[PDB]
Write a protein that binds this ligand. Structure first.
Ligand SMILES: *[C@@H]1O[C@H](CO)[C@@H](O)[C@H](O)[C@H]1NC(C)=O
Ligand SMILES: *[C@@H]1O[C@H](CO)[C@@H](O)[C@H](O)[C@H]1NC(C)=O
Ligand SMILES: *[C@@H]1O[C@H](CO)[C@@H](O)[C@H](O)[C@H]1NC(C)=O
Ligand SMILES: *[C@@H]1O[C@H](CO)[C@@H](O)[C@H](O)[C@H]1NC(C)=O
Ligand SMILES: *[C@@H]1O[C@H](CO)[C@@H](O)[C@H](O)[C@H]1NC(C)=O
Ligand SMILES: *[C@@H]1O[C@H](CO)[C@@H](O)[C@H](O)[C@H]1NC(C)=O
Ligand SMILES: [Ca+2]
Ligand SMILES: [Ca+2]
Ligand SMILES: [Ca+2]
Ligand SMILES: [Ca+2]
Lengths: 486, 515
């Protein structure tokens, strides 16, 4: 399925000026050192997470810092993401900063939760340390990008504990004896993120690594033809068709989802099923051993039966936000909870706070306001609970409803517990900044269409790459040309 | 009445090829000779039944050993002649019990050595012949020269057969210095099957016990002295999980043990004396201390403190004062750093002539820092770091005369000893070492040693040379992966405890070696 496949994180690393000074002002020293850190983090991910960390690119600042590195990891993370947005042109799944300085916090790095594949979000910042230590810091930063957030709820309950207490676990705090391992709860969090539609960019295998080709690493570099993984592993798949990184007599391929053994899979065979209704199935090209790069529906397609909208391949609803913050057993409150409590302008619901006062929502915006779930805990899975839990009770005509919420802080700015931007407040309407807006207010990009009032001329689906995926018998970039192949 | 093997004169008797020493020898025979005898040894009291002999002769015999007190029961013997025999061993007390012995000859037996005090206790002796033997001159014979000097008896000159340097030299002419034979050493005594992170000692009710932290079982192990066979045995345990450091503290005949764990740990225990079991007293705040690498005990100005180094970025190294009902937080240190080790030392800081309490703690990927306590603020200030030093794990200190030195352990590269100058530590000695997790100074009977542990290599034990003012290579211990070394003193007995992370713990005796 999606979680049985090998996932590949394309990674860029930026070394700041102090990291350059730690190394004696040697570019080769800095770059090879960071290659060592990435190598160890790759050894961590390779087994437990069935995921590989590949370094596509690196740059080091020899002269000075492009922006001032901050002792607060979150501030440095934010400005670093500004840098990579306005400056770095290189294609990567994640861009991480290696800082020679030291953060004034317990966290040795900061990374956005579920950030991968995102231009603004994907990335992290990591303070200087020992190779083995900084490999752990990078491992937990890329874990935060990858969707593994410690269950603050199962931890406080004692549900998720580290099987080995001697070193604890990666998602456990740094100490002299470096954590080598992820909890089973972490792996479950990662599987749940992949099945949720996140991480579509992790499914493509790189070709040219930053280091000269070596036959037998499992990657096809320049000058090779086929590669299986290892001599012992090769026997499982690819040992038949692959000899000394050169194809045998009959093979089109060595290893892959589209390679049956030595031969290609016919065009139109499905290597990957869609994980949700935001996802587009992928078919084997028959020109390639790899499953075609993972793509999903473009942002703005409706999911969950006009209960939510797709962003980055993941469905945004208020119920999934309630389950995200408070755990799976929690469900979102009835719409009447919003339609009543939010217009009051109290701590039990509101549009937000201005000076030490709650704003009462307008009747139009009432679904964009304070997030209300049904039976709530006091310990959110992520972030910091600020204050107490809100519970009111509203009667409708014989049905007594419980409206509960809480203020969960991640960034001093970003606050969970208010309806996430992009959640539908109604037909063709989404929430932005606690207000209910029509779709055109998001200015969505569109694919090609040859027909008035249709997407992909009505014959196809708009992907997140802004290319039309045609239905059967339809061809062309707009899918307007009918070309049956039988 | 004459024994069958022997043929007897009127006053004398002669025994040839006798298979045993006859007990039936008739009285008024004052002389007995054994020649080419069958028996291969002379046991104790063999002659008890023949008290009347004034003379005894042994010639042309092969003897495994002549036992202690073989001649006991011969008060009247003036003359004892052992000559031209093969004798493998001669006991120190063999001649004990003859006061009346006048002439004694060991001559021509080709004896390689003699035991000390073999001539002790014979007053009457006017003559000894040691000639005709091949003597290897060594410690064993070191006494002989001294005896030759102070003896009343007449002894003709005898010569060393060996060693090659001293061969054909008069034993009387020799001086003690030429006998060499000086050593000191550590020898393995006990082997503990359990692997141990750290070891410590304490004195409770004038009894010195030993605490050993075994990480992988989580149990804090206690060893007490047993006189029955071996001085070290395990009386008691404290149960825990992922125990790292176990530090006993005795305050006014009340035992307190601070034990740090990597799981839900950092608990303070006290010994309830009536039940003589340990009871949990306090729990260190889990937010302040998270992954302690270390615990350090010190007492300043009639106050007790202990400080815990936190190698987590999250935890802060914290010092806990004793209010007398227990321990409570005093000062957090080195916030946001990973602290491998904390070390307390009292060092003279110029201009001050008095010694002042100082802390030294070692942060990973960082220079060690020194902290000077200020009495007015009751706290350390003016943070200063050891200059030109990279990547240390621990710092330990020792004093020779008035000056103080520190042993800086660097897991990679050179580990080195520095001397404290007026304002600063100056480089003294640099020893590179491979995977060294400990550098331990020790002082045993005014003997300063420095043990440098190694995982991949041998553990190198060094001795302090007063003339050279540096450590000198001394001995090499084999211990699998030592994290620690600890000096234990029983009464008049000294032991060395070597913990092993990947292997069994080692217990060595402290041995002084002479003759
Ligand atoms: C076939 O593979 C080549 C690369 O060998 C690629 O350039 C081309 O686009 C592929 N065609 C199809 C239809 O996948
Ligand atoms: C609603 O939940 C709150 C706790 O969030 C609780 O105090 C209250 O009793 C609940 N009411 C009902 C009717 O379940
Ligand atoms: C959206 O952007 C397009 C061009 O990018 C522009 O023509 C249009 O006016 C924009 N609409 C809004 C509402 O900003
Ligand atoms: C050796 O003889 C001297 C006198 O010459 C005497 O003073 C001394 O006590 C004697 N020593 C022994 C052990 O008999
Ligand atoms: C100490 O602990 C070990 C194992 O943890 C146990 O076998 C031993 O009997 C204990 N000894 C005492 C004296 O408690
Ligand atoms: C410590 O500060 C005091 C003044 O507060 C000063 O006298 C002393 O020289 C300082 N020590 C060092 C090592 O700078
Ligand atoms: Ca990618
Ligand atoms: Ca290759
Ligand atoms: Ca897909
Ligand atoms: Ca210490």
């Amino acid at each position: 399925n999606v979680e049985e496949e090998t996932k590949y994180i394309e990674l860029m690393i930026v070394n700041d000026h102090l990291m350059f000074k730690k190394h004696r002002l040697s570019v080769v020293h800095t770059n090879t050192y960071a290659k060592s850190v990435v190598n160890m983090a790759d050894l961590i991910y390779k087994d437990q997470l069935k995921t590989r960390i590949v370094l596509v690119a690196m740059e080091t600042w020899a002269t000075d810092n492009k922006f001032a590195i901050s002792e607060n990891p979150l501030i440095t993370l934010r400005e670093f993401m500004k840098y990579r947005r306005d400056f770095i042109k290189e294609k990567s799944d994640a861009v991480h900063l290696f800082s020679g300085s030291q953060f004034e916090s317990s966290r040795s790095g900061a990374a956005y939760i579920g950030g991968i594949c995102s231009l603004l979000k994907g990335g992290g910042v990591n303070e200087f340390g020992k190779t083995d230590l900084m490999a752990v810091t990078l491992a937990q930063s890329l874990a935060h990008n990858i969707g593994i957030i410690s269950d603050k709820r199962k931890l406080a309950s004692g549900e998720c504990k580290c099987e080995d207490t001697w070193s604890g676990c990666i998602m456990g705090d740094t100490g002299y004896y470096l954590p080598k391992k992820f909890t089973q709860c972490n792996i479950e969090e990662y599987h749940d993120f992949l099945n949720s539609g996140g991480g579509a960019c992790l499914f493509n295998k790189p070709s040219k690594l930053l280091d000269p080709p070596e036959c037998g690493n499992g990657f096809i570099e320049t000058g090779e033809e086929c590669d299986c993984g290892t001599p012992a592993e090769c026997v499982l798949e690819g040992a038949e068709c692959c000899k000394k990184c050169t194809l045998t007599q009959d093979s089109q391929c060595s290893d892959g989802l589209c390679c049956k053994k030595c031969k290609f899979q016919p065009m139109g065979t499905v290597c990957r099923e869609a994980v949700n209704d935001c996802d587009i199935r992928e078919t084997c090209s028959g020109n390639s051993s790899q499953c075609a790069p993972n793509i999903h529906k473009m942002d703005g397609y409706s999911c969950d039966g006009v209960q939510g909208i797709c962003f980055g391949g993941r469905c945004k609803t208020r119920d999934r936000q309630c389950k995200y913050i408070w755990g799976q057993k929690v469900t979102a409150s009835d719409k009447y909870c919003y339609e009543k409590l939010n217009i009051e302008g109290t701590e039990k619901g509101n549009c937000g706070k201005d000076k030490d006062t709650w704003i009462q929502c307008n009747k139009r915006d009432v679904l964009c306001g304070y997030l209300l779930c049904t039976n709530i805990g006091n310990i959110p899975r992520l972030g910091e609970l600020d204050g107490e839990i809100t519970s009111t009770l509203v009667v409708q005509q014989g049905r007594t409803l419980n409206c509960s919420g809480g203020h969960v802080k991640l960034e001093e700015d970003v606050d969970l517990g208010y309806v996430e931007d992009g959640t539908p407040c109604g037909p063709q309407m989404m929430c932005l900044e606690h207000r209910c807006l029509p779709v055109a207010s998001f200015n969505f990009s569109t694919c090609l269409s040859s027909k008035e009032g249709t997407i992909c001329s009505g014959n196809g689906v708009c992907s997140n790459e802004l290319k039309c995926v045609c239905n059967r018998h339809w061809i062309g970039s707009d899918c307007n040309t009918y070309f049956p192949h039988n | 009445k004459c024994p069958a093997v022997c043929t007897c004169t009127k006053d004398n008797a002669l025994c040839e090829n006798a298979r045993s020493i006859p007990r039936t020898v008739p009285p008024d025979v004052i002389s007995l000779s054994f020649v080419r005898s069958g028996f291969t040894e002379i046991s104790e009291g063999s002659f008890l039944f023949t008290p009347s002999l004034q003379l005894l002769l042994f010639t042309s015999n092969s003897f495994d050993v002549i036992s202690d007190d073989a001649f006991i029961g011969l008060p009247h013997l003036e003359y004892l002649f052992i000559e031209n025999n093969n004798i493998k061993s001669i006991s120190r007390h063999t001649f004990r019990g003859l006061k009346s012995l006048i002439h004694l000859s060991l001559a021509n037996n080709n004896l390689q050595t003699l035991p000390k005090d073999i001539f002790k206790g014979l007053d009457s002796l006017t003559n000894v012949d040691l000639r005709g033997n091949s003597f290897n001159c060594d410690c064993k014979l070191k006494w002989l020269v001294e005896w030759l000097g102070h003896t009343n008896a007449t002894v003709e000159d005898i010569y060393c057969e060996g060693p090659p340097e001293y061969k054909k030299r008069k034993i009387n002419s020799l001086s003690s210095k030429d006998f060499d034979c000086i050593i000191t050493e550590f020898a393995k005594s006990q082997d503990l099957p359990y692997q141990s992170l750290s070891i410590d000692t304490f004195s409770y009710l004038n009894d010195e016990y030993v605490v050993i932290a075994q990480p992988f079982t989580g149990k804090c192990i206690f060893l007490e002295w047993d006189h029955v066979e071996k001085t070290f045995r395990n009386y008691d345990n404290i149960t825990g999980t992922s125990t790292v450091v176990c530090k006993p503290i005795v305050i006014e005949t009340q035992l307190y043990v601070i034990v740090a764990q990597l799981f839900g740990g950092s608990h303070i225990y006290k010994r309830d004396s009536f039940a003589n079991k340990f009871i949990k007293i306090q729990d260190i705040e889990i937010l302040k201390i998270r992954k302690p690498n270390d615990i350090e005990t010190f007492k300043i100005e009639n106050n007790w403190y202990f400080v815990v180094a936190d190698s987590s970025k999250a935890g802060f190294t914290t010092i806990y004062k004793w209010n007398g009902n227990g321990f409570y937080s005093h000062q957090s240190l080195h916030a946001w750093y990973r602290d491998t080790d904390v070390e307390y030392l009292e060092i003279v800081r110029t201009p001050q002539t008095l010694r002042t309490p100082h802390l030294i703690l070692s942060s990973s990927s960082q220079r060690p820092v020194i902290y000077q306590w200020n009495k007015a603020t009751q706290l350390f200030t003016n943070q200063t770091d050891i200059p030109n030093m990279e990547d240390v794990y621990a710092v330990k200190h020792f004093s020779v005369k008035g000056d103080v030195y520190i042993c800086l352990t660097r897991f990679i590269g050179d580990s080195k000893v520095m001397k404290w100058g007026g304002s600063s530590f100056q480089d003294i000695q640099r020893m590179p070492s491979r995977g060294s997790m400990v550098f331990q100074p020790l002082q045993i009977n005014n003997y300063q040693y420095a043990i440098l542990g190694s995982d991949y290599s041998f553990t190198q034990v060094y001795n302090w040379d007063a003339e050279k003012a540096k450590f000198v290579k001394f001995q090499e211990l084999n211990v699998q992966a030592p994290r620690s070394f600890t000096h234990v003193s029983i009464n008049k007995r000294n032991f060395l405890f070597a913990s092993s992370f990947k292997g069994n713990t080692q217990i060595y005796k402290h041995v002084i070696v002479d003759l």
